[PDB]
Amino acid sequence: RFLCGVVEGFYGRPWVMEQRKELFRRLQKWELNTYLYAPKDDYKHRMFWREMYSVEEAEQLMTLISAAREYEIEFIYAISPGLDITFSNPKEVSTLKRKLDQVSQFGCRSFALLFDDIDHNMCAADKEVFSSFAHAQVSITNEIYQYLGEPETFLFCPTEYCGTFCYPNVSQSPYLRTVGEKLLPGIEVLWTGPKVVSKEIPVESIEEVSKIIKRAPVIWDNIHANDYDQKRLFLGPYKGRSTELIPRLKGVLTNPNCEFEANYVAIHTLATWYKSNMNGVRDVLYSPQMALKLALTEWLQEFGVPHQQFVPGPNEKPLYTAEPVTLEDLQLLADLFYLPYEHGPKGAQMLREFQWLRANSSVVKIEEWRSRAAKFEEMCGLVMGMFTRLSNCANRTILYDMYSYVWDIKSIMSMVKSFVQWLGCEPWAFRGGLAGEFQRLLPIPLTPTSKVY
Amino acid sequence: RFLCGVVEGFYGRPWVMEQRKELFRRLQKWELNTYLYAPKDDYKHRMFWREMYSVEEAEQLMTLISAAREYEIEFIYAISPGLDITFSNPKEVSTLKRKLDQVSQFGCRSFALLFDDIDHNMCAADKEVFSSFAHAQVSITNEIYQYLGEPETFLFCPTEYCGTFCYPNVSQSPYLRTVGEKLLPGIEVLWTGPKVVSKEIPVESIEEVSKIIKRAPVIWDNIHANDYDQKRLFLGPYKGRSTELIPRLKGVLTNPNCEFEANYVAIHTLATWYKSNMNGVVLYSPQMALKLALTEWLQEFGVPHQFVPGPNEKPLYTAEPVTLEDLQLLADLFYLPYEHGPKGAQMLREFQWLRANSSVVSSEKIEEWRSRAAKFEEMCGLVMGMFTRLSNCANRTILYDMYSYVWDIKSIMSMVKSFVQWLGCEPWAFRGGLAGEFQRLLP
C-alpha cells in the first residue's frame, strides 16, 4: 500500500473542480492512486478552516470526492488549523471535529492534519496545558484520528518537515522525537526531504528521519513546485530520488506547478519512477532522461486537440499558422524550464555559449567567435520558433497556462540575440519592477529595436 | 462623439465573457463608453482570423454584444489579419468580409482592422499590385469600411503606431504619408504616443501626428499594460497625458493589465481624467485621482464574489482586514511603467543609503544607521502585513488576480530585511530561472 500521486499543496490560485477531475483521469491513466486536497489559499482549508462548507460548496466537493472514487483515486482531505487554533481549548477541538465530519459525510474516508509554515511559539493558554508545540499537535492529531474512527489513511505534516527545519538537527530534534514517540502508529507523517525543495532525497537521509519519527514517511515532494518564484516553471523529469527509496517509504505525493497544464511531465515522470520499482525490496530501473522523452512524447498529442481549405500560392504570403508544435520544440521548452537546481542541456549550452561570447567579445581566433555567435543566433532562433508554433496551437488551455513563461523566455532570448549581433559590429529597463530593483542589490524599412512586442 | 473606455488588446490569456460583462458594468458606472475587442491570443481574432465563429461561440458573442448595448457601451470588434493575409487576393479579402458579416449579424455596429506588431514586408504577388505596405492596408481597410456601409465607428491601427516605430521620423514617414492620404476620412486611427509604452503624451506629439494622418487620433494607451514583463503590475494612476489632449483627440482606449481585477485604478482614474475636461478647446491630479480610486476599490475587497479568543488564547489570524493604507502601499510598490510610488521609492532609497553606509558598523554616524535601519525593518513589516491581510480578504477573485505579485514583493522584502538585519551584524540562487541568468549578463 504505497500512496503515490499529487498533493495540491501550493500557495496561490487553487485548481478548479474541472481540473481536479481531469487530474484524477490522468492519475488513473498513469497507474497512480492518490490525491491530497491541500490548497493553501482555498479559504476553507486553512485561513478559515473553522467555517463549514456552504450548500453549493458541499455539492461541488461531494461530486469531486465521487469523481475520485470513480477513477480509483484515494481522496485525502487535509485541513490546516495551525495559524490560530487554540489546541488546549476543546470548543476549537470540537470545530475541527465538525469540519472534518461534514467532509466525511461528503463521502471522504481519508484525512490529514497539516502544521507546515506556522510559527513555533504558542499562546499562554496552550503552554499551561502542553509541554511543547509538538505535544499539542500530537494531542489533537490523535484525538481527531480516533474520533474519525482510526481510518486506513490519516496523514500528519510536521512543522519541522524537512532536514533544515529540524532544531537543532534531524536526529536530535525534541519536536520530531515527540512526534515519533507520541503520534499514534496508525498515522503517517509527511516529509519533503533535506530542504523544502530537495535537489536530492538520499536514502541515508530517509533512514535517519524514519528512526526519529519511528516510521517510514510519505514524501511531500516540492521538486516541481513553482509558487515561490513568479518567473519559474518546471518541466524537467522527476529526478534526484533513487528507486531504492520506494521500499523505504510509505508514499510520494508531488506538489507541482501552480499552472495545472504545466504538470504533464511532472506527474507522468513520477508515475514512470514509481512503476519502475513498484515491488522492489531492501541495475538501473529509472532514467530521468528517458522518462522525460517518454512524457514529452505523450504530452505532444495534447497540443493538437482544441481547448477541451485555403493554401496560398507560391507568390502569396505563407500561413503563419502552418507548422505545428514538435517534440523538438517541447524538448527545448523543457530544457529551458527544467528543474529548480538545474537547466536542461540545450538551456545550459545556450547560457555557456553566451557566457563565452560575452567574455571574448573584445576580439573586434576571430573565425571562432564569428562561428560560435552564428551557432548561438541559430539557437536563439529555435526559441522564437518554439514560441511561435506554441502560440498557434489548437490546445489553447495548455497555451494559456504556459503563455507568460514562453513569452518571457522568447523575449529575453531575443534581446540576447540582439546583444550578440551588436557585439559583432521602453520598460526593458525598469525590468523586474521594484521587486527586481531590490533583488539586484542582494548578494548572489530598418529592422526595429525597442520593439517591446 | 468621444471614444473613451477600454481595449482588450494585450498578449496572453484573454478575459472571459463573465469578466467582459462586468467590465461593461464598471465602464458604465464610471461613465466611460467604449470597449474594443482585440485579444491578441483569442485564436479567431488574429492567428485564425479567417475562421468563422462556431455556433456555441456565436451565442456567447451575441450575448456579450447584447450586454454592451444594455450597459450603453459601444462594442467595437477588431480583427488582425497582418501575419498571413495576401492583401492582393480577393478570396482573402472575401474571407475577411464573410467574417465581419457574421459579427454584424450578432448585432455589432462598430469594427476595426489592426495592423500592429507585424513585419513591414509584403509577399511577391502583393508587391506587384501595391506600391507600399501602407497602400495595401489602406486599400483593404477602405474596401471593408465601405462594404459595411461606412460604419459610424471604424478603426485602423497602423503598423507604425507610435513615434519610435515611424521610419525615419513621425512627420516624414512614407507609411504615415500614404495612410493620412489614401485612408478614407471617416475611418479613425489608433496611436500609442511617442513610444509603445508612453511615459508622456505631449500635445506637440499629437499636433505633429495629427498633421501627417490628417485627422485626430484615438489613443491606444499602453500605460498600464503588463504583458511584456512577468513580474510587473501597474496599480498606479492615469498620468502623463494632459486634459489639454482631449479636444485634440477622438478618444483614449486604455489597454490595461492582463489580470482583470488589477485594472480598477487603471480604468477608474482614466474615467476621472475624462470627466475632468469632457469639453474645452491643473484640473486632473494623479494623486487625488488615485485616492478616490483606491478608496472605492477597498469596498470590493471585503465582500465575496464565529469564535472569539480569550486574551489567554491564540488571536484570529484572519481578524484584521485590508485597509486603505495597505492598498496605498501596494499601489506604490506596483505603480507605473517608469516610476515607483512614493512609499516605494522611499523604501528603495533607504535600502541604498543603508548598503553604502554599511561598513560604518565595522558614533554620531552609527546612531544614524541603526535607527534608519529599524525604521526600514518596520517599513518591511508593513509590506508583509498588507500581504497577510490581503491573503485573508473575502473577495478571493481579486486576491487570486494579485496573488503572485503580492507574494513576490513580500518575499523579497522579507529577504531584504533579513539582509539589513545582517549587514548590521534553498532556491534563491537560480532566482528568475534561465531567463534570469541571461538578464544579469545583459549590460
Other C-beta atoms within 10 Å of A345: how many?
13
Locate B202 and state its grid cell.
Answer: 505631449
User: What is the rounded distance in angstroms from the CA atom of residue A26 to the CA atom of residue A270?
Assistant: 12
User: What is the rounded distance in angstroms from the CA atom of residue A15 to the CA atom of residue B58?
Assistant: 28
Q: Do B421 and B377 meet the contact criterion of CB atoms below 8 Å apart? A: yes
User: What is the rounded distance in angstroms from the CA atom of residue A431 to the CA atom of residue A452?
Assistant: 12
Q: Do A141 and A183 meet the contact criterion of CB atoms below 8 Å apart? A: yes
User: What is the rounded distance in angstroms from the CA atom of residue B294 to the CA atom of residue A415?
Assistant: 36
Closest to B42 measured CA to CA, from B357, B258, B350, B288: B258
Mark B128-149 as b/e (b = at least 16 C-beta within 10 Å): eebebbbbbbbbbbbbbbeebe
Q: What angle do CA A412, A415, A417 make, to 5 degrees?
A: 105
The answer to whether the annotation marks A149 as part of a ligand binding site is: no
Other C-beta atoms within 10 Å of B88: how many?
22
| Residues B112/B113/B117/B118 CA torsion (nearest 10 deg) | 170
Mark B279-310 as b/e (b = at least 16 C-beta within 10 Å): eeeeebebeebbeebbeebbeebeeeeeeebe
| DSSP alpha helix (H) spans, A85-173 | 90-104, 124-129, 133-147
List A42, A101, A117, A408, catalytic entry: A117
Alpha carbon distances (Å) from A213 to A160, A260, B21, B28, B251: 11, 33, 54, 61, 68
User: What is the rounded distance in angstroms from the CA atom of residue A57 to the CA atom of residue A37?
Assistant: 14
Instruction: Please name the residues in contact with B381: beta carbons below 8 A apart, sequence gap of 6 or more.
Output: B417
Mark A299-326 as b/e (b = at least 16 C-beta within 10 Å): bbebbeeeeeeeebeeebbebbbeeebe
Alpha carbon distances (Å) from B92 to B51, B120, B131, B140, B149: 12, 19, 19, 10, 20
Helix (H, G, I), strand (E, B) or coil at B113: strand
Locate A107 and state its grid cell.
Answer: 463521502
User: What is the rounded distance in angstroms from the CA atom of residue A441 to the CA atom of residue B439?
Assistant: 14
Helix (H, G, I), strand (E, B) or coil at A391: helix
User: What is the rounded distance in angstroms from the CA atom of residue B263 to the CA atom of residue A428?
Assistant: 22
Element (H, E) at B365: helix B364-390
Return the sign of the alpha-carbon dihedral for residues B111, B113, B116, B118.
positive
* B364-390 and B342-352 helices, crossing angle to 10°: 140
Q: Do A189 and A226 meet the contact criterion of CB atoms below 8 Å apart? A: no
Q: Do A350 and A379 meet the contact criterion of CB atoms below 8 Å apart? A: yes
Q: Which of A47, A231, A340 sits opposite B392 (nearest CB)?
A: A47
Q: Do A110 and A76 meet the contact criterion of CB atoms below 8 Å apart? A: yes
Ramachandran angles phi, psi of A65, nearest 5° = -60, -35
Closest to A74 measured CA to CA, from A35, A45, A104: A35
User: What is the rounded distance in angstroms from the CA atom of residue A390 to the CA atom of residue A321?
Assistant: 10
Strands, E, within B251-368: which ranges?
251-254
| Helix and strand counts by DSSP (H, E) for chain B | 14, 8
User: What is the rounded distance in angstroms from the CA atom of residue B397 to the CA atom of residue B90?
Assistant: 46
Ramachandran angles phi, psi of A335, nearest 5° = -70, -30
User: What is the rounded distance in angstroms from the CA atom of residue B127 to the CA atom of residue A452?
Assistant: 28
Region of residue B344 (left: phi > 0; alpha: psi -120 to 50; beta: else): alpha
User: What is the rounded distance in angstroms from the CA atom of residue B17 to the CA atom of residue B66?
Assistant: 12
Q: Do B125 and A316 meet the contact criterion of CB atoms below 8 Å apart? A: yes
Closest to A144 measured CA to CA, from A90, A106, A75: A90
Helix (H, G, I), strand (E, B) or coil at A221: strand
The answer to whether the annotation marks A121 as part of a ligand binding site is: no
Shortest Cα distance from A295 to chain B (angstroms)?
22
Q: Which DSSP symbol is given to A22?
A: H
The answer to whether the annotation marks A117 as part of a ligand binding site is: yes
Q: Do A232 and A340 meet the contact criterion of CB atoms below 8 Å apart? A: yes
Q: Do B40 and B80 meet the contact criterion of CB atoms below 8 Å apart? A: yes
User: What is the rounded distance in angstroms from the CA atom of residue A192 to the CA atom of residue A254?
Assistant: 9
Other C-beta atoms within 10 Å of A124: how many?
13
Q: What angle do CA A282, A287, A292 make, to 5 degrees?
A: 135
In the numeric block, the cell 513621425 is attached to B170
Which residues share a beta bridge with A35?
A: A6, A75
User: What is the rounded distance in angstroms from the CA atom of residue A172 to the CA atom of residue B53?
Assistant: 66
Q: Which of A48, A411, A442 sits opposite B416 (nearest CB)?
A: A442
User: What is the rounded distance in angstroms from the CA atom of residue A191 to the CA atom of residue A180?
Assistant: 13
Q: What angle do CA B232, B238, B239 make, to 5 degrees?
A: 100
Locate B317 and state its grid cell.
Answer: 489570524
CA A180 to centroid of chain Cα atoms: 27
Q: Which DSSP symbol is given to A171?
A: T
Locate B111 and state its grid cell.
Answer: 469594427
Q: Which DSSP symbol is given to B49?
A: T
Strands, E, within B200-278: which ranges?
218-221, 251-254
- Which value in Å is the resolution of this experimental model? 2.5
**Euclidean distance between the first and the last CA atom of chain B, given in angstroms as a whole number:** 47
User: What is the rounded distance in angstroms from the CA atom of residue A194 to the CA atom of residue A208?
Assistant: 11
- Check if B120 contacts A (Cβ < 8 Å): yes
Question: If 0-12 CB within 10 Å is exposed, 13-18 middle and 19+ buried, where does residue B414 land?
Answer: middle
Closest to A322 measured CA to CA, from B46, B84, B82: B84
Region of residue B237 (left: phi > 0; alpha: psi -120 to 50; beta: else): beta
Judging contacts by C-beta atoms under 8 Å, the chain B residues touching residue A85 are 314
Helix (H, G, I), strand (E, B) or coil at B315: coil
Ramachandran angles phi, psi of A333, nearest 5° = -50, -45
Q: Do B343 and B328 meet the contact criterion of CB atoms below 8 Å apart? A: yes
Judging contacts by C-beta atoms under 8 Å, the chain A residues touching residue B396 are 41, 43
Other C-beta atoms within 10 Å of A19: how many?
14
In the numeric block, the cell 524537512 is attached to A162
User: What is the rounded distance in angstroms from the CA atom of residue A87 to the CA atom of residue A65?
Assistant: 29
List residues forming the annotated binding site of B: 9, 40, 116-117, 161, 227, 255
Shortest Cα distance from A213 to chain B (angstroms)?
24
Interface test with B, best of A229, A307, A323 (most B CBs within 10 A): A229
Which residues share a beta bridge with B34?
A: B5, B74
Shortest Cα distance from B153 to chain A (angstroms)?
27
Contact A41 B429 (CB under 8 A): no
Mind telling me the catalytic residues of B?
Answer: 117
Helix (H, G, I), strand (E, B) or coil at B34: strand
Give the A:B interface size as CB pairs under 8 Å: 242
Interface test with A, best of B89, B317, B333, B416 (most A CBs within 10 A): B317
